[PDB]
Amino acid sequence: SSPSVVGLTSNCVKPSSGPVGPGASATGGYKVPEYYSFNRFSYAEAEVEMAKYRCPQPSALK
Amino acid sequence: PPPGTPPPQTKTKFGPLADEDRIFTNLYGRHDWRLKGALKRGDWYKTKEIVLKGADWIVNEIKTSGLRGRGGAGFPSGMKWSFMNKPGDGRPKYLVVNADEGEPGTCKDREIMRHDPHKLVEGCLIAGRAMGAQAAYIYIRGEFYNEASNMQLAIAEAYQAGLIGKNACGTGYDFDVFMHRGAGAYICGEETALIESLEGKQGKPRLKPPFPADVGVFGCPTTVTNVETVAVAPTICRRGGVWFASFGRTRNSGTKLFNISGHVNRPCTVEEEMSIPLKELIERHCGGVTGGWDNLLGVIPGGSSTPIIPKNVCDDVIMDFDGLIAAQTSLGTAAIIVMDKSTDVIKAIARLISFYKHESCGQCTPCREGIGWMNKIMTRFVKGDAQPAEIDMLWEISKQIEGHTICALGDGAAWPVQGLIRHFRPEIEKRMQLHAKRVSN
Amino acid sequence: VRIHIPPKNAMQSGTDNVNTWQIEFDNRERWENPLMGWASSGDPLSNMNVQFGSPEEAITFCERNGWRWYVDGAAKPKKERVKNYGINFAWNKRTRVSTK
Amino acid sequence: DNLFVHRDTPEDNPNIPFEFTAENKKRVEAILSIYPEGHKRGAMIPLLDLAQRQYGWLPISAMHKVAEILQLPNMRVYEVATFYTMFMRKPTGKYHIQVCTTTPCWLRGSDDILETCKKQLGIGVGDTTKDRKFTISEVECLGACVNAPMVAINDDYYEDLTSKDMQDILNDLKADKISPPGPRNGRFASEPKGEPTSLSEEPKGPGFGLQAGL
Amino acid sequence: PEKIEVFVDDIPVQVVPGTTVLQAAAQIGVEIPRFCYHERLAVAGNCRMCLVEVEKSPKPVAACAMPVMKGWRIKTNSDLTRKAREGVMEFLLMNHPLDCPICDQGGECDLQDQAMAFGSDRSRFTDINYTGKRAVEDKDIGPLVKTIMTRCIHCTRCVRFASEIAGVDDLGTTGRGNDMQIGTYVEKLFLTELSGNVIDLCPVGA
Ligand SMILES: Cc1cc2nc3c(=O)[nH]c(=O)nc-3n(C[C@H](O)[C@H](O)[C@H](O)COP(=O)(O)O)c2cc1C
Ligand code: SF4
Ligand code: SF4
Ligand code: SF4
Ligand code: FES
Ligand code: FES
Ligand code: NA
C-alpha cells in the first residue's frame, strides 16, 4: 500500500488492543483509535518520517 | 453581474439545515477518519480539476459564496484571499492556517482536526492555489497535542498518496504542508501575533499596516485564515458558490458550527444554518435550558469577548452577524454559553475579565494594565465592596481601552463589562447594597 | 557674548524650550565662600540671559551695546529620516529586529 | 509564585549537564529543516518543547543548549521560554494536573473538582508533591468547553468529570495504573448525549451535487 | 517622489510618501506626545501615547507608526485626541511607584512633563486602599547603571537600543501581562562602551 500510516513507533497500540479511551474502537461507534493511542513523543517522531516527501525550500541568504 | 456578487437571499425561514447540506459530515467521528474513509466521503475528489481552473476562478467562486471568516472578525474572505493574489513581488508566499482554539466556550476547531483532518489538508491546497502560496503552515495549540499528532498522521497519508508535495494532485503545483505546535498562549490566535510566533519571536501582535498580505511570516506575504474557513473552501468549489449562498441571510450566507455549552441539558457541538433563531437552536439539538426556558438568565453569543445579552433579548435574537449587531453584541466564534437563573452573573463575568488579564501579551499600555484595573474593580464587585458610583467609572474605563490597543484583545476585554453594566446593573447595585447592611450591621 | 541656541536636554524628548536664540556672557571665576562654603563671585553679568528670534537680531542688539560677540553655528535643519515600520520585519535585509 | 527571574538552585543551575539524546538529536535535524534557510529561529518553540518532554521541566542548561543549536544570544531564548505558559521553569514531577477553571467549565461545577484534587493529594494550587509525582495547577481553557468540566493530565483530556469519577482517576494514578481518558458521561466525543440528532443519515459519498463545471 | 498633501489641524502640508503622521506634524511645529517612539530607534507602538484622530476613521491611529496617506485631515488638538491622551496617562500612572521626591529623573521626567501637559489632574485609582499598586524586583545590571524597575513604563527604548545600536542583545523582555519585566533573566553585567546612553533613553527613572 502507498498510503501507509505514520510508523508504528508513533502509534501507541501497535495497532489494536481492543476498545480504548471512552469507547473508541476500530469498528465501534467512534472510529478513531488513533486520537487516544499516541506516544508521548509521537508528534516529534512523525516529523522524521515526512522529511522524505517534503521538497526543497526557500533561502533568505545572500 | 460582477464576480463578487453573491446571489440575494430569497428565503424567509432558516431553520432545518437538511442533512445533505451539512459540510462536515464526520463531525461526531462516527466513520473512518482515514484516507480510505474520507475518500469514501469524496474529500479528495476532483482536486486536480479544481486547481487547474485557475486561482482567479477559485476566488470568484468564494466571493460568490459570500463566505465571511469564521475566526471571529468576520471580514469577508473573498477580498482577504485577493489581497495576497496581487503579483507584485518575487518572494515566497505562505498560507498560515490558524488552528488555535483559545477563545473560551469554543470547541469547534477541535472537531475539524480529530475526525476530518483530510478536509483541512484538502482545503489548504485549494486555498493554496488561490493565494499561489509555496507552502502552508498549520498552527495548533500546545494543549491540543493528540490532535496535532492526529493531524500529522493525516498529512503523512496525503504525502504518500501523492496528494501534496511535488506534483500535488498531479496539477504540476508544488505544495508542502507543515505543522507548528505553538506553546500555550491565548494571544497567539491573533493574525500578527501568530505570524510573530512562527518567526520564533516572543509572540506579540504587530501593528497594521503593513498588513500580512505585504509582510508576514519571515517578512513574506501571508494569509492567516481559520480552519473552518479553509475546511469549507473545497466544498464550495465542488458544490458551487451559489449553493452556499442559498443558506443564511442575504449578507450572511453559509452554515456555521455552534458549540452550545453552559447550563444546557445536552451540551454539544452542532452544525446549523446561520441566521437560525436562537430559540429554535437550543431546543432542537441541546434539549433546552436546564430549568426550562424560563430559567434562562442570558447567554454569551460568541464566547468571551462578546457582550452578554439578557433573557428578554434572547426571545427574538437571530444567530447571525447582522442580526446580533442589532442586539449590541457580536457573533464572534458562535459559541453559546447559556446561564441558568441560579448563576452568579457577576462572578461569571469576573472570571472572564480575569481570563484576559492572564492572556494580555503586555505589549501595549491599555491592555497591559488597563485590564489589570478592571480585574481589581470586578473582584470588589463580586464581594460587593464598592460604592455604587464606581459603576460609571467601570463603564468609563472600558471606553478608554476600546480602540486604543494594538490588537483586538483589548477591544475584546471591554465588551463583557459593557454588556454586564448595560443589562445587569440593577443586580450589581443590589450586591453592593447588601454589602453595606452586613458590614454596617 | 556668545549667541547660541540653548542646548536641548538629552534626558527629555520635548523641544519647545529650544525655540529661541540666547546670549550668555563669559563664565568668569567663582570661589568657595570662606565662612559657610557657598559659591561666591564678583561677576554681575555672569547671571545674565536674554532671548531673541534670530541671530541677526542678536548681533544687532550686541552691536548697539558695544559688546564683543561670537555666534555658535546654527544647527542645520535635521535631514529627513524615513522611519518606516514594516522594515522591522524584512525577508533578506539586516534591518529585521530580533526583539519586540 | 512563579518568578520571571532565575535564581541559582541545586535543581536548576547552568552547570547542570543536559543534552539531547541520540534518538532526540535526529529529531532536531528534522525540525530545523522546516523553516527557511535564513530564518531558523522559528524552531525555538519546537526545540524548547522537545527539551522539556525529555526532561519533564525546562532547566536553564536546556535553554542554553537550544541557543547553541540556533546560534543566538542566550536571552532571546529566555524571552520566548518565559512568555509561553506550558514551559515549566521549575520542577514539575511526573503528573501535571491541568484543571480548567474559566467559564463555562466553572458553570458546570469546576470548583468541586479543584477542591477534591487538593484534598485527595493534600497540596495547594500551582504546587508539587513531595515525591514530585503530582503537580496540581489551574489552567485557563483547554478548548474542551463543550465536554466541561474537564481535566488534563500531561497530554490527555479527562472530560465530563465529577467528584466521584475524578477520585477514581487519582486513585488509579496513585496506584501507577493507567486510566482510560476521554469523556466519562457515556458520550464518545462532543456528541449530544443520548440519541443522535444530526449526521444519522449516511454520508452521501463522492461527486454529489457537483458544480458540473469542474 | 511627488509630495503628498495632508492637513494637520486643517493646515496643508507637503510630505514625501511614506512619512509618518508624527513626522508630518513636526514640519508644522506640532509635537505629539510620545514615550516609545525615539528618532534613532526602530519604531514600536507600545506606549499608545501618540494616538491621534483622523477624519473619517473608525479609531485613533498611532502617529509614530502610521504612514501618511493623501488627503487625510489629522486632528491633534481635538476632543477625541485629548480624551485618548488622558486615558493613557490615567493608565500609565496607576502603578508608577510614587517616588518623585527620591527619583533622579524628577524635574527632568517625561512622565511628569507629559502628565501636566496632557494628562488629567485627578486620580480615579480607588484601589490603592484595597490591593495596592504593583511592585517589581530590582536588577543588578552593573556599576554604572542603577536600576529601579518598579518605575519602568515598558517603553522598550532600552531593549531596542541595546539590540540595535550597541548590538549586545543581553537585555530583553520576560513575562507577560502586568508581570512583564525588562532585564536580564540571569544576573549579568550590561558591559558596553555605549552602556551609558541607556540612562538617557529611559524616559522614566528606572
Ligand atoms: C486576542 C485574539 C485571539 C484570537 N484567537 C483566534 C483563534 O483562536 N482562532 C481563529 O480562527 N481566530 C482567532 N482570532 C481572530 C484572528 O485575529 C483573525 O480574525 C482570524 O484568525 C482570521 O481568519 P478568519 O477570516 O476566519 O476570521 C483572535 C483574535 C484575537 C484579537
Ligand atoms: S491589546 Fe493586549 S494582547 Fe493586544 S497587543 Fe496590546 S497588550 Fe498585547
Ligand atoms: S520616573 Fe516616576 S517617580 Fe521618577 S520623577 Fe518621573 S514620575 Fe516621578
Ligand atoms: S527600563 Fe526604561 S527604557 Fe526600558 S522599557 Fe522600562 S521605561 Fe522603557
Ligand atoms: S472553559 Fe474549560 S475547556 Fe474551555
Ligand atoms: S510613541 Fe507611538 S505608541 Fe509610543
Ligand atoms: Na532615565
Curated annotation (Swiss-Prot), chain C:
Full-length numbering of the shown residues: 84 to 183 of 183
Places the protein is found: Mitochondrion inner membrane
UniProt entry keywords in alphabetical sequence: Electron transport, Membrane, Mitochondrion, Mitochondrion inner membrane, Phosphoprotein, Respiratory chain, Transit peptide, Transport, Ubiquinone
Gene knockout outcome: RNAi-mediated knockdown results in mitochondrial membrane respiratory chain NADH dehydrogenase (Complex I) deficiency. Mitochondria in the flight muscle shows a wide range of structural abnormalities including dispersed cristae, onion-like swirling membranes, swollen mitochondria, sparse matrix and irregular cristae densities. Eclosion rate is reduced, locomotion and feeding are severely impaired and lifespan shortened. In the brain, there is a pericerebral fat body deficit.
UniProt family annotation: Belongs to the complex I NDUFS4 subunit family.
UniProt record, GO biological process: mitochondrial electron transport, NADH to ubiquinone
Name of protein: NADH dehydrogenase [ubiquinone] iron-sulfur protein 4, mitochondrial
Membrane topology reported for the UniProt record: Peripheral membrane protein
Main location: mitochondrion
Entry annotated with the keyword Coiled coil: no
Record-level GO cellular component terms: mitochondrial inner membrane; respiratory chain complex I
Chain positions found as Phosphoserine: 98
Function summary: Accessory subunit of the mitochondrial membrane respiratory chain NADH dehydrogenase (Complex I), that is believed not to be involved in catalysis. Complex I functions in the transfer of electrons from NADH to the respiratory chain. The immediate electron acceptor for the enzyme is believed to be ubiquinone.
Top-level taxon of the source organism: Eukaryota
Recorded coiled-coil stretches: none
From Swiss-Prot, chain E:
Chain positions recorded as [4Fe-4S] cluster 1 binding sites: 96, 100, 103, 109
Domain annotation 4Fe-4S His(Cys)3-ligated-type: ranges: 80-119
Sequence positions that bind [2Fe-2S] cluster: 36, 47, 50, 64
Domain 2Fe-2S ferredoxin-type residues, every copy: 2-80
Intracellular or extracellular location(s): Mitochondrion inner membrane
Annotated binding of [4Fe-4S] cluster 2, by residue: 152, 155, 158, 202
Assembly, per entry: Complex I is composed of about 45 different subunits.
Function: Core subunit of the mitochondrial membrane respiratory chain NADH dehydrogenase (Complex I) that is believed to belong to the minimal assembly required for catalysis. Complex I functions in the transfer of electrons from NADH to the respiratory chain. The immediate electron acceptor for the enzyme is believed to be ubiquinone. This is the largest subunit of complex I and it is a component of the iron-sulfur (IP) fragment of the enzyme. It may form part of the active site crevice where NADH is oxidized.
Family to which this protein belongs: Belongs to the complex I 75 kDa subunit family.
Full protein name: NADH-ubiquinone oxidoreductase 75 kDa subunit, mitochondrial
Taxonomic classification: Eukaryota, Metazoa, Ecdysozoa, Arthropoda, Hexapoda
